[PDB]
């Protein structure tokens, strides 16, 4: 998950 940013709220 490097670079993959944030998860669905």
């Amino acid at each position: 998950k490097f670079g993959k940013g944030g998860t669905y709220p």
Partner: antibody, heavy 114, light 113 residues
Framework: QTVKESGGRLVTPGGTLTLTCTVS????????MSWVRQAPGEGLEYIGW?????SAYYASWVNGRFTISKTSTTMDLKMTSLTAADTATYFC???????????WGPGTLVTVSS | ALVLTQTPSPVSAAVGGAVSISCQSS????????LSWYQQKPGQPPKLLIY???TLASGVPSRFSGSGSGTQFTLTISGVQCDDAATYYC????????????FGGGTEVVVKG
């Protein structure tokens, strides 16, 4: 949160076009983005994505013909050597870490024609 | 190379009935569940319905449900309405020294009124 594509137009075969995806309501430092296209009457086709650090990755068929880059508020798709196989609606999406693509833009149409 | 294969178009359902669409991955999806479902009506952008195989996105009607893990995924519409007539797409990723992603070919749902 919104994304909006721009730049779609008639382009000559062999030509080059750059599309722009303009975002608002979220940071490109905090979310990944993707380009997806759809040929008329055909399915969604994944093109590539760009990570929060600006590293772009591509579908195996792209073969260096396309470049994805970003700014603070935009992401581009530069496309070279365009043919009729590239005629499509081009969408940008925010791509959540856990895989959901949301939101989508309205799409911009690229018509590769003489 | 990750290939996602969907139930062939078209699939039918009577209004008030139920329809199921399959999405089969050629490889195990990341965490066995990083599979999402999209609704697309003609001339509109896709809409996210479900992510992580079975979690509904904000505002999506509970008549949509997703199930499956690993390689075999199902979207089910319960109490089908005319407003559900659309093309449905799955999208999945696996990690093979980087993210390898694809869409299924889309399943058109024809609603019989």
């Amino acid at each position: 949160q919104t994304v909006k594509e721009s730049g779609g137009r008639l382009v000559t075969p062999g030509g080059t076009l750059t599309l722009t995806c303009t975002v608002s309501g979220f940071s490109l430092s905090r979310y990944a983005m993707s380009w997806v296209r759809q040929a008329p009457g055909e399915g969604l086709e994944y093109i590539g994505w760009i990570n929060t650090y600006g590293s772009a990755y591509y579908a195996s068929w792209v073969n260096g013909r396309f470049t994805i880059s970003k700014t603070s508020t935009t992401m581009d798709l530069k496309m070279t050597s365009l043919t009729a196989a590239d005629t499509a609606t081009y969408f940008c999406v925010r791509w959540f870490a856990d895989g959901g693509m949301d939101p989508w833009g309205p799409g911009t149409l690229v018509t590769v024609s003489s | 190379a990750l290939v996602l294969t969907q139930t062939p178009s078209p699939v039918s359902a009577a209004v008030g009935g139920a329809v199921s669409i399959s999405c089969q991955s050629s490889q195990n999806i990341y965490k066995d569940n990083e599979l999402s479902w999209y609704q697309q009506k003609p001339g509109q952008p896709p809409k996210l319905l479900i992510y992580k195989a079975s979690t509904l996105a904000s505002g999506v009607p509970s008549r949509f449900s997703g199930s499956g893990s690993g390689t075999q995924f199902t979207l089910t519409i319960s109490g089908v309405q005319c407003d559900d007539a659309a093309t449905y797409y799955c999208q999945g990723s696996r990690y093979n020294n980087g993210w390898d992603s694809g869409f299924g070919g889309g399943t058109e749902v024809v609603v019989k009124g």
